[PDB]
Amino acid sequence: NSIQIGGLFPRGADQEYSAFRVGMVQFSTSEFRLTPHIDNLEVANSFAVTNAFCSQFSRGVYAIFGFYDKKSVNTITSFCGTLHVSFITPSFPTDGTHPFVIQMRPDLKGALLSLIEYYQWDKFAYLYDSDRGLSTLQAVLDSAAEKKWQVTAINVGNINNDKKDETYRSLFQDLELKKERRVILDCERDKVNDIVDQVITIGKHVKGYHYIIANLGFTDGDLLKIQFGGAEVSGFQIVDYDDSLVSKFIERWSTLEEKEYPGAHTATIKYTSALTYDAVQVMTEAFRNLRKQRIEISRRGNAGDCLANPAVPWGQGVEIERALKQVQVEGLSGNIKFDQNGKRINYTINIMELKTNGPRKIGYWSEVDKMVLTEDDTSGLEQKTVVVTTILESPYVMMKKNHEMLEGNERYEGYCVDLAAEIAKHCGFKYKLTIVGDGKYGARDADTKIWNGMVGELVYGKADIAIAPLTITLVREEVIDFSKPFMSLGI
Amino acid sequence: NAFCSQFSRGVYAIFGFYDKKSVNTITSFCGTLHVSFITPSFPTDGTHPFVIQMRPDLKGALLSLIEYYQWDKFAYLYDSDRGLSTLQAVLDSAAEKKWQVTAINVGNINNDKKDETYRSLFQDLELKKERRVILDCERDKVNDIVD
Amino acid sequence: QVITIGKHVKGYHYIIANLGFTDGDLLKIQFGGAEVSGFQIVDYDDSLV
Ligand SMILES: NS(=O)(=O)c1cc2c(cc1Cl)N[C@H]([C@H]1C[C@H]3C=C[C@@H]1C3)NS2(=O)=O
């Protein structure tokens, strides 16, 4: 059953169309086949989109797969909600709940709010691009008003190429006025690779700055530039290379010839092409389940004018979309589930931070569960709170009256407490205030030389340092060492 | 449908209104078919051919009014249906003149909840105790909000 | 390698000990913040030059 479908592709989406051609024969043909009529046409001109849509409707296909632009989403929704034709896309998700649209891209906005609340920022700048839409820009301002954030948002998208070396300099020098430190970028990969190069030219990737990329292919762009910088860069992945089917597709994809499939003979892949690959799995599962329920999709006639007055559609497409919303398979993004509208739920997004060796993950974020870090504590050097032994003596070391409500190093008070604070301030170490067990100053045992008290805590490797009323003798220099004396006294 | 019908009728001059959703469709037809279109609707953003528009721009006057009243911190309630060009405009001057701007959408709220949602909105403004409000909507929303 | 590891901010200072000071690349660290000085024996302002 070679079923007629329609395909919309931009002039330049070569990796995505190549991935579609791969997924065409990656798994098919025990059954129905597909008849893809491909339209390598533009996406900006909605008149061209209209011409292509009426041409594929004159073909009279059952499903249309492709992309759209923000100058075209109204056109696609307005025609599909009329003519009841199911439309499937990997582009940015729509704003209103629209019928007959299945959209392959998960949300980013809740993840990004989770990330900001994890890093605990208060004031930052937000470079956005207009041509991807403004849904995230609308979303962040609400939580900025509620969570008392200070947002300086700046449009950057409409700047021409021919002044695109000094516009950015003027922009970041204006950011120098408030002395900005925290930047969230929201662009396409080309604008990312332009702006990173201009930042690395003007020298703003030292230790001190911090960057968040708001995309899905965090490692799909260039990161060898600012890998060794000093700044810290975090982002998001939906394609995780550690998994079995993922690495299988990596090996299969790397072994292909670049001349047959352009942009395919690499190691990594674009997330757009990954969702394009998973779309074929969903679209084949659909007709699989319709032959499982044995419901015929016989058009039984021709299609006609898309300007039919009034046009009347056919509700077996409603049943097609109904079975589309029930598909649940595993793919490159992981599990998939749909809502009552065609939006994706049941996804998982990895949080990816750049380090010196390269990118790595620190945690995940679910559709309902918040940011769950994976406890990747590779911190091999922790400055240990050193062992400080003492004994209770007024006014050297005294208890406070509210010691149960307070905690630890706050509980003790006196001359020695103040002094140990001064020593730790000058020497930069961490410390924890402890008490000797046996409550003595300490002397040696007869015939066994067992130094008890605070002496054996330092002799026997138990305690680390002792700021305490201890007297320099002759018999104590042989086992421990003293500094210069700080307070004189006598019997 | 209506535009294809009247061009089939052979119209010499097209006139009509447009909302924020049909504007790309109308300019995309008019750039191709070279038909002079006239409108009182909201002005566009890019320089598009064959579109004459009677409603003048507003953004320079509104920025001049802000500079005359000599403000630094204010709230800004907007509706999405007329466009977001003014919202994109005032944020740049906020970035230059270092303004403290809180901007909140209002256009999504349905009619069955427009007694308590607005109250919650003004209570959340009174968390900061705002004194200076720019409303940016249509006349219907203005009459609904001033009450 | 300096411009990769990020050591051309305001604060650093460089002296090139050659004769073709502008014969090498200087568009890289022109906008840096550091200051670079060197030597020329070929002066482009002159008539025969
Ligand atoms: N007046 S006191 O007992 O509190 C006191 C006693 C002493 C102080 C400082 C004070 Cl405030 N520092 C001296 C040191 C300073 C120098 C000279 C000897 C030591 C090095 N040791 S000390 O003679 O033990």
UniProtKB/Swiss-Prot annotation, chain B:
Name recorded for this polypeptide: Glutamate receptor 2
Family named by the database record: Belongs to the glutamate-gated ion channel (TC 1.A.10.1) family. GRIA2 subfamily.
Post-translational modification: Palmitoylated. Depalmitoylated upon L-glutamate stimulation.
Domain text: The M4 transmembrane segment mediates tetramerization and is required for cell surface expression.
Oligomer status and interactors: Homotetramer or heterotetramer of pore-forming glutamate receptor subunits. Tetramers may be formed by the dimerization of dimers. May interact with MPP4. Forms a ternary complex with GRIP1 and CSPG4. Interacts with ATAD1 in an ATP-dependent manner. ATAD1-catalyzed ATP hydrolysis disrupts binding to ATAD1 and to GRIP1 and leads to AMPAR complex disassembly. Interacts with GRIP2. Interacts with GRIP1. Interacts with NSF via its C-terminus. Interacts with CACNG2, PICK1 and GRIP2. Interacts with GRIA1 and SYNDIG1. Part of a complex containing GRIA2, NSF and NAPA and/or NAPB.
Localization per record: Cell membrane; Postsynaptic cell membrane; Postsynaptic density membrane
Source organism of the structure: Rattus norvegicus
Top-rank taxon: Eukaryota
Additional notes on this entry: The postsynaptic actions of L-glutamate are mediated by a variety of receptors that are named according to their selective agonists. This receptor binds AMPA (quisqualate) > L-glutamate > kainate.
Protein function: Ionotropic glutamate receptor that functions as a ligand-gated cation channel, gated by L-glutamate and glutamatergic agonists such as alpha-amino-3-hydroxy-5-methyl-4-isoxazolepropionic acid (AMPA), quisqualic acid, and kainic acid. L-glutamate acts as an excitatory neurotransmitter at many synapses in the central nervous system and plays an important role in fast excitatory synaptic transmission.
Gene induction: Down-regulated in the pyramidal cell layer of CA1 in the hippocampus by global ischemia.
Tissue expression per record: Detected in forebrain. Detected in dendrites of neuronal cells. Expressed in the pyramidal cell layers of CA1 and CA3 and in the granule cell layer of the dentate gyrus.
